[PDB]
């Protein structure tokens, strides 16, 4: 009779579609209005551990400031250009000093502080706009980097394929959990201040996700199995298959409507402004995953198999050959 589950509270933080509510590989869960025009943006309530963007055919890394023709590189990355005074990038001590008169903000955890700090950058001199920029925090540097470019992928292999191919291309890139992003966290404007309690972080040693069925934790019924030499590789796989908000109808020669659809705001000449807009039977929501995807994996350290699945788990099985991992989780860290 009783149909409750004593696992419910413990497992809430693996109910990713609820706590996170957006894409993970690619997060463009919300739309905000800037100066009349509507743009897509990240909106994930949880930090994405390990995630960064890989720029294809460029030396330049993604936390290098965007191209303005000044100090960092030419072609540049995704980060806010230098400013006076410099709000980005900014260290932990530097942030805590800037917000020292604000009791709530000055005591935030490093990750929520960075998202909040980023939240303070005004889009295109629009004072009352809901549009806030995402950000990446680096635990080695202790540096919050504010992202000027909120798009996370553009690489249809018609232009992008060698790594740039033809005569007049501009930016090819994709989200990844590269080994060099291990200390990075991708932070949307919405990262909650209580993430370390409601969001995944560390992978679970000697644990396997399961389903609560008739007072019992049973195996996940339907999993897909991939080879994975180590936990990192299983995490990369889960992250590759996780909730995506990418326009899964990808274009060719990018039109302005398709530019915005990828989460582009500025073609840098000014703002990207659609004259016809999305119209008809579209809803405007056909690429909002709301956190729906293959967000979880059961890594078997013995068979080297990454058992990946798209239903939320509702208990844990004790099994010494397993590590339970999520697409939000740290690529490496185990508890």
């Amino acid at each position: 009779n009783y149909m409750g589950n004593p696992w419910t509270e413990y497992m809430a933080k693996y109910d990713i579609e609820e706590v996170h509510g957006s894409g993970i590989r690619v997060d463009l869960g919300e739309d905000a209005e800037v100066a009349g025009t509507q743009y897509r943006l990240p909106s994930g309530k949880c930090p994405v551990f390990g995630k960064g963007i890989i720029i294809e055919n460029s030396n330049t890394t993604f936390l290098t400031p965007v191209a303005t023709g000044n100090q960092y590189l030419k072609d540049g990355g995704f980060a806010f250009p230098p400013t006076e005074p410099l709000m980005s990038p900014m260290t932990l001590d530097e942030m805590r000093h800037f917000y020292k008169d604000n009791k709530y903000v000055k005591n935030l955890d490093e990750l929520t502080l960075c998202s909040r700090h980023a939240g303070n950058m005004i889009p295109d001199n629009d004072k009352n706009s809901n549009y806030k920029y995402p950000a990446v925090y680096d635990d080695k540097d202790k540096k919050c980097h504010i992202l000027y470019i909120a798009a996370q992928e553009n690489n249809g292999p018609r232009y992008c394929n060698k790594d740039e191919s033809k005569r007049n291309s501009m930016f090819c890139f994709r989200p990844a959990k590269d080994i060099s992003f291990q200390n990075y966290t991708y932070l949307s404007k919405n990262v909650v201040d209580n993430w370390e309690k409601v969001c995944p972080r560390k992978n679970l040693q000697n644990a396997k996700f399961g389903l609560w069925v008739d007072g019992n934790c049973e195996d996940i019924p339907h999993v897909n199995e991939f080879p994975a030499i180590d936990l990192f590789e299983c995490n990369k796989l889960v992250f590759e298959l996780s909730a995506s908000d990418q326009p899964k109808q990808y274009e060719q020669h990018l039109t302005d409507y398709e530019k915005i659809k990828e989460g582009f705001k500025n073609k840098n000449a000014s703002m990207i402004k659609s004259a016809f807009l999305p119209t008809g039977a579209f809803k405007a929501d056909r690429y909002k995953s709301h956190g729906k995807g293959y967000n979880w994996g059961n890594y078997n350290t013995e068979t080297q198999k990454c058992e990946i699945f798209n239903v939320k788990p509702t208990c844990l099985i004790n099994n010494s050959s397993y590590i339970a991992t999520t697409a939000l989780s740290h690529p490496i860290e185990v508890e």
């Binding site: 250009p81 400013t83 006076e84 008169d101 303070n120 005004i122 009352n128």
Partner: protein, 116 residues
């Protein structure tokens, strides 16, 4: 920095007047722009006030202070008012500038009743 907002509370009669003063205190940069927000008594949603009509703003950029005067007060004006400061940022070249969302006052709890 922090923004000093007065008064904290106001009990007014319909038709009366209210001035909310705000001061940007220990601020490295100058006041570049300002905004005003209100949560109506009944809602939990803070919303943009539209300056104009009975809502009149003065901004003193020299002294880093700004104020909102509401005249001919209406019950519908009731709620908690917050002012917000914005700072400027020059990109290391130019000539484009960029706004930054600064500190916000602690609020003004305005109650507006008629006679009885």
């Amino acid at each position: 920095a922090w923004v000093d907002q007065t008064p904290r509370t106001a009990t007014k009669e319909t038709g009366e007047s209210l001035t909310i003063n705000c001061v940007l205190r220990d601020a490295s940069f100058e006041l570049k722009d300002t905004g005003w927000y209100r949560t109506k008594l009944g809602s939990t949603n803070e919303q943009s006030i539209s300056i104009g009509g009975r809502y009149v703003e003065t901004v003193n950029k020299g002294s880093k202070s700004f104020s909102l005067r509401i005249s001919d007060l209406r019950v519908e004006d009731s709620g908690t008012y917050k002012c917000q400061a914005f700072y400027s940022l020059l990109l290391r070249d130019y000539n484009y500038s960029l706004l930054f969302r600064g500190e916000k006052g602690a609020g003004t709890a305005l109650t507006v009743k008629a006679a009885a």
